[PDB]
């Protein structure tokens, strides 16, 4: 649907559309301002930087790749992550923050592009039946696990960046 992809084609489209927009925004923003803690954060009342936002996106995108790739190698997978429950997603996002705290904006953007390319490759190697035809992780399809961690967060990031750019001298 327009809300949540329900086919392989829709998933690829949402990724392509939302990521193309995101990368256009990330390539526009002067890197010199990407450490200002001037964006509203995920939890209300917090603040984050553009670099921090890229770090959060990278963590979710790397995670879904790790789930799929590890499963495909016949390895057990902890969801959402080893040591975390599904009601600890803020805590998990803070792991990403620490994981990537010393990485530059430029390296983060490059890494995000790399893992986005890898998720597209994983999708391309599969079919609609694999992605949407049956459950994969408990009640959820693989395709939904992918959009939940890629196209949906990309679109949220795009909206956050549009709002922020209005107060930071950036047209986009
Ligand atoms: Ca903001
Ligand atoms: Ca505050
Ligand atoms: Cl989703
Ligand atoms: Na989906």
Residue numbers in the entry: 0 to 171
What did the publication describing this PDB structure actually write?
PdDfsB adopts a four-helical bundle core structure that belongs to the DinB structural superfamily. The most strongly conserved region of PdDfsB is the C-terminal helix, which is present within the mature Slf sequence.
The second, related clade contains DfsB homologues from mainly Gram-negative bacteria, again including many pathogens. We were able to express, purify and obtain crystal structures for DfsB homologues from Clostridium difficile 630 and Escherichia coli UTI89, as well as of IRC4 from S. cerevisiae. The overall structures of CdDfsB, EcDfsB and IRC4 are identical with that of PdDfsB, with strong conservation of overall topology and surface charge, particularly in the C-terminal helix.
